[model samples]
Target: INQVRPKLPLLKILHAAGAQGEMFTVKEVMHYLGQYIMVKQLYDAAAQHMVYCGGDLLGELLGRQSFSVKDPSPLYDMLRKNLVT
Candidate 1:
């Protein structure tokens, strides 16, 4: 509800993406994650709407196995769980 800081799992990803911050608002989290996703070009070339969760940081944050999602709502939900309230 207040300013939330990232936990270890999420921190790894944000740091790897070269984003420096101890605490983040939900908007910042979303923006940084989207920026990283764009940097890695996670979106499928053929299906631009789909983003693949195949990298180490993303996999660790979401789950171990790889998968693709067209919507970001679930991803937001998962990331929210990693925030220190």
Candidate 2:
């Protein structure tokens, strides 16, 4: 029980969706309700959906291997700023 509490936010979302018999993608959910939700809340919701659907958003995030080494320092700086704050 203690080990699972931290995951409750996500689990609650999943259970609610299941109870309502609704299906949605993380991207869609984020796009529709993202403004009303924090990043952590969105992450939890997506995480719950992934768990129930046997999907892996983390894997998708990690498996992306495309990047440009071109002199895009400005782009990199913007991305860094977004990630950090």
Candidate 3:
């Protein structure tokens, strides 16, 4: 059997920082913030003014194979939950 493990680079950075007993450096924080801003821009541009709509920009960013509407309920629920919490 082949086992695959997903690597989280950000978590690795956090763990390394913790081991060193030091805070994230300004550069580290800026790097994370940059990713946050990029993702936010992608989300806003891709899913806008609708209950559930995958915008083209996100597809480009993620290199999505194709877009489909499998379930609206889950998408709606997630949006609502995220917005509320």
| Predicted model with the maximum lDDT | 1
Per-model C-alpha lDDT, please? 0.74, 0.30, 0.34
lDDT of 1 by residue, 42-65 (tens): 777887766777565686677735
What does candidate 3's lDDT look like per residue over 1-85, in tens digits? 2222212333343333332223444344335423443444433345532221234322333244333344334433322332211
lDDT of 1 at 74: 67
Name the runs in model 2 displaced over 4 angstroms: 1-8, 11-22, 32-35, 38-85
lDDT of 2: 0.30
TM per prediction: 0.78, 0.19, 0.24
Q: How far is candidate 2 from the true structure (C-alpha RMSD, Å)?
A: 15.9
Candidate 2, residues 40-85, lDDT tens digits: the string is: 3333453432221113332233232222223324323432332211
- Considering summed lDDT, which 10 consecutive residues are worst modelled in model 2? 1-10
**lDDT of model number 1:** 0.74
**Which residue pairs in candidate 2 collide?**
none
Best by TM-score: 1
